[model samples]
Target: NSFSGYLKLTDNVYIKNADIVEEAKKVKPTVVVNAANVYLKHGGGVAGALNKATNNAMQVESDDYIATNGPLKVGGSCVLSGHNLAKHCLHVVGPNVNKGEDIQLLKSAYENFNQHEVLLAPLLSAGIFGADPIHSLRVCVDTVRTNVYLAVFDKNLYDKLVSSFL
Candidate 1:
């Protein structure tokens, strides 16, 4: 598991939960970060009923909501956005299956990052809409070569994806 692209660290960062909890014991933050993204990919703007649902879900104390489109004919998908488990989990819609290494697409996504945030992507393109975790993990690692790599480990797969191809 390795990622080849890394933007110069420009300040925005997320500590692990264990670190966050430990630090919270010393100081509190008015805004805490949670990696969850719902309904922002698939060329669908974050609006309408799903937008309401996303915000509503967030209101329950989580910073945001995160999940795929759940195999519906009338909804969107987000298998390409790549940043499916950051501060907000975007719905990366695609052809309902995982593709092989796509450096061009991944690099394009990285170009959109700015000062406040940067794009994060899984190596080898993990997190397909409907696929097994182990297969997704292998594919994700085979596609990119960066300083770090993310794979399916327990329920927290794709958690360490970083912005590459920038």
Candidate 2:
């Protein structure tokens, strides 16, 4: 199933009710955003597929860098090495709602990623990360400019996004 809609965030924002794994292939330079954790472990959520797409090199870089640089703080972003899947990868840490983190950290993550003009991204601060989906979506909708692609893998999320646009 596929869905596409335009809701002017004063930006070229495309909402797709599809998985990022498949969508990543079609994006140019594929500036994909990995909705990740501080450790950049690539263990959960979109990180798992993205890690595989990068042939694990993304994690390797993160591992090597973090071992010396310390864990990435919430709302910060790190540039990841590119693979055939994506010419540039932006690894970002969002707020963990379960642990009491809020939308501000998720906002920071989106703002940081926004500066990079990333086009492909998964739902941030939600799912395994545990932020409220509605708040997370609103942040993403507000912070981005230029090209943007938001892949919503969940059916309910896609519907909610649709409702927001119209």
Candidate 3:
């Protein structure tokens, strides 16, 4: 099996996973999604990596976005800019699905990205949140209306994702 695969969900909207960050680097998506928290905090999982790459400035930017237009509940989001690699990062607060009431909330998070022409999003509510990776990826694929790119970094997660979708 190869390292990556691409699935076209519609004429314009697509689902490409397997080596997704590398795919983003190659495709250079202008808009990417950041699975974040309600308080705009950063320092773990994808948030920490994104903050480090952007020189810790994303947190400050996110703070401002939250302050001005925030207190986002589960399924709400805001955009942060100035990263040299990607133009914008849509920070979406995901629900802790272990509690079991927020699966819809987690799925709703992707609804905001429908307007963009190209979007790169990770498997939300997975990873540290410990939700089912297959389930989260399906929600992302189902909700996003753009040319969506889903990147899976974890080896186990990637394997599970490829097995299920590819």
Candidate 4:
């Protein structure tokens, strides 16, 4: 008895399960996060869509950023101009999480955004980097869920989000 377009999860966070690029153009959030590599290459994934959204301005500007500042450290974050869809495009070099790197680093990457309103956050791993789909959705749901404005809907009201999809 809710919106079919959005997969109900917790309040303020849900999965589009559609082409996010198209979805984002409609939502046009204040800021969108890019699951970038250390090098800030916008080859594919949401990073790729970001470049497209900004008409390659995002990519062109980021190329200059990497050229000037060198590779971004894992867990570090930065911002770039959205140029179109949103006001800003935030880039964070999340650790190659599935590669046995520390999850804390990924957490830090997500944590850094806590001070600001996180309108969008792509899963830091579980794409080209390779990770369990369940894990990807879980970590993202965890971080964005934690950044909630209202109390969320939880399964069992006990374990909560800890044990949902398996």
TM per model?
0.27, 0.86, 0.82, 0.75
Q: What does candidate 3's lDDT look like per residue over 19-54, in tens digits?
A: 544554455568877878788787788777767666
Deviating ranges (above 4 Å) for candidate 3: 1-27, 99-101
Which 10-residue window of candidate 2 scores lowest in summed lDDT?
A: 1-10
TM-score of 3: 0.82
lDDT of each: 0.28, 0.75, 0.70, 0.63
Instruction: Return the TM-score for candidate 1, rounded to 2 decimals.
Output: 0.27
Per-residue lDDT of 116 in model 2: 63
Please write out the lDDT profile of model 1 over residues 1-166, one tens digit for every residue: 2123223322332212233222222333222222222333322222122223344443322222234223312122222211212333323322223444333343322222221232232222223433443443333344323322122222343243222211
Tell me the deviation in Å of residue 106 in model 2: 1.3
Q: Report the lDDT tens digits of candidate 2 across residue range 1-166.
A: 2224434443566677777877776554557788878888988678988888767877888899789888889999887665766777788889888888766787788887667654677768888878767778777777766577778888887888678667
Q: Which ten residues in a row have the lowest lDDT in candidate 1?
A: 73-82
Q: How many steric clashes does model 4 contain?
A: 0
Top model number, lDDT: 2
Clashing pairs in 4: none
Q: What is candidate 4's lDDT per residue for 1-166, written digit by digit as tens?
A: 1123544466555544445465557666677677788888889877887677778888788899999999888888888776776677778777775677776676677665665664555556646666554565566556653432211222242133334632
Q: In terms of TM-score, which candidate is stronger, 1 or 4?
A: 4
Candidate 1 ranges with C-alpha deviation above 4 Å: 1-91, 98-128, 147-166
By lDDT, the better pick of 1 and 3 is 3
Clashing pairs in 3: none
